[PDB]
Design an enzyme around this catalytic site. Sequence first.
Site, PDB file in Angstrom:
ATOM      1  N   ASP A  16      -3.677  -2.772  -4.786  1.00 25.03           N
ATOM      2  CA  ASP A  16      -3.807  -3.360  -6.117  1.00 25.03           C
ATOM      3  C   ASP A  16      -3.163  -4.754  -6.273  1.00 25.03           C
ATOM      4  O   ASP A  16      -3.095  -5.259  -7.369  1.00 25.03           O
ATOM      5  CB  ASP A  16      -3.288  -2.408  -7.182  1.00 25.03           C
ATOM      6  CG  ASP A  16      -1.839  -2.076  -7.017  1.00 25.03           C
ATOM      7  OD1 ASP A  16      -1.106  -2.675  -6.186  1.00 25.03           O
ATOM      8  OD2 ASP A  16      -1.417  -1.166  -7.759  1.00 25.03           O
ATOM      9  N   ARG A  30      -1.977  -9.098  -9.497  1.00 26.58           N
ATOM     10  CA  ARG A  30      -1.996  -7.664  -9.677  1.00 26.58           C
ATOM     11  C   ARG A  30      -3.290  -7.359 -10.438  1.00 26.58           C
ATOM     12  O   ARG A  30      -3.556  -7.936 -11.465  1.00 26.58           O
ATOM     13  CB  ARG A  30      -0.797  -7.262 -10.554  1.00 26.58           C
ATOM     14  CG  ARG A  30      -0.783  -5.769 -10.959  1.00 26.58           C
ATOM     15  CD  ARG A  30      -0.697  -4.830  -9.782  1.00 26.58           C
ATOM     16  NE  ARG A  30      -0.280  -3.480 -10.208  1.00 26.58           N
ATOM     17  CZ  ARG A  30      -1.116  -2.551 -10.660  1.00 26.58           C
ATOM     18  NH1 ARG A  30      -2.406  -2.823 -10.794  1.00 26.58           N
ATOM     19  NH2 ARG A  30      -0.655  -1.351 -11.021  1.00 26.58           N
ATOM     20  N   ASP A  35      -4.379   1.542 -11.114  1.00 24.50           N
ATOM     21  CA  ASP A  35      -3.262   1.935 -10.286  1.00 24.50           C
ATOM     22  C   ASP A  35      -3.820   2.564  -9.038  1.00 24.50           C
ATOM     23  O   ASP A  35      -4.551   3.558  -9.122  1.00 24.50           O
ATOM     24  CB  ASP A  35      -2.392   2.945 -11.018  1.00 24.50           C
ATOM     25  CG  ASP A  35      -1.657   2.339 -12.201  1.00 24.50           C
ATOM     26  OD1 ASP A  35      -1.592   1.092 -12.331  1.00 24.50           O
ATOM     27  OD2 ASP A  35      -1.146   3.113 -13.032  1.00 24.50           O
ATOM     28  N   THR A  36      -3.521   1.958  -7.896  1.00 27.48           N
ATOM     29  CA  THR A  36      -3.872   2.540  -6.598  1.00 27.48           C
ATOM     30  C   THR A  36      -2.681   3.287  -6.039  1.00 27.48           C
ATOM     31  O   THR A  36      -1.543   2.934  -6.351  1.00 27.48           O
ATOM     32  CB  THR A  36      -4.301   1.480  -5.545  1.00 27.48           C
ATOM     33  OG1 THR A  36      -3.275   0.493  -5.430  1.00 27.48           O
ATOM     34  CG2 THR A  36      -5.601   0.802  -5.933  1.00 27.48           C
ATOM     35  N   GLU A  38       0.141   3.887  -3.412  1.00 22.96           N
ATOM     36  CA  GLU A  38       0.798   2.734  -2.810  1.00 22.96           C
ATOM     37  C   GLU A  38       1.280   3.004  -1.394  1.00 22.96           C
ATOM     38  O   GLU A  38       1.522   4.145  -1.040  1.00 22.96           O
ATOM     39  CB  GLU A  38       1.896   2.194  -3.727  1.00 22.96           C
ATOM     40  CG  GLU A  38       1.316   1.432  -4.936  1.00 22.96           C
ATOM     41  CD  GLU A  38       2.367   1.023  -5.953  1.00 22.96           C
ATOM     42  OE1 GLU A  38       3.193   0.137  -5.645  1.00 22.96           O
ATOM     43  OE2 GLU A  38       2.353   1.581  -7.070  1.00 22.96           O
ATOM     44  N   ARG A  82       3.493 -12.035 -11.320  1.00 24.29           N
ATOM     45  CA  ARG A  82       2.117 -11.793 -10.780  1.00 24.29           C
ATOM     46  C   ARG A  82       1.038 -12.088 -11.849  1.00 24.29           C
ATOM     47  O   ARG A  82       1.173 -11.626 -12.989  1.00 24.29           O
ATOM     48  CB  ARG A  82       1.996 -10.324 -10.339  1.00 24.29           C
ATOM     49  CG  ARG A  82       2.934  -9.962  -9.156  1.00 24.29           C
ATOM     50  CD  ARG A  82       2.861  -8.512  -8.810  1.00 24.29           C
ATOM     51  NE  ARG A  82       3.123  -7.587  -9.922  1.00 24.29           N
ATOM     52  CZ  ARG A  82       3.189  -6.283  -9.735  1.00 24.29           C
ATOM     53  NH1 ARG A  82       3.049  -5.816  -8.490  1.00 24.29           N
ATOM     54  NH2 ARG A  82       3.386  -5.457 -10.741  1.00 24.29           N
TER      55      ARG A  82
END
Length: 136
Positions: A16, A30, A35-36, A38, A82
């Site tokens: 992500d 970002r 939401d991936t 991690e 980010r």
Amino acid sequence: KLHKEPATLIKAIDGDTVKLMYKGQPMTFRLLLVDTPETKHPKKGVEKYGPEASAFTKKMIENAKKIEVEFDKGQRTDKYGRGLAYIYADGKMLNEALVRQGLAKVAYVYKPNNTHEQHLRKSEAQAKKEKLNIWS
């Protein structure tokens, strides 16, 4: 109204997060609204489908002809500096592609950075229904 601007790949970091050259400067982005799992989770380190999500983003971004970033209507950076954007690889939104493949969930949404929320929720519903990856 949102618009797309060009950027150039520097490095895929995670599922992500990607670093791009944007308006002549290296900048970390970002992906908005997703939401991936991690590989560089601050507390957990490496989660299930983490490597898969990271590989998918990497491949999609490294093999693209054209990368564009699209900011939403609200804040354009988070507290870590980010860029918060929708990222397109050859006109396909990476944020959506991840959710569609069951490699990301739709995030907790902070208005007014929620323009494509409904679209992404629809992709997530389809991934769930097909029991893909995270949803299997």
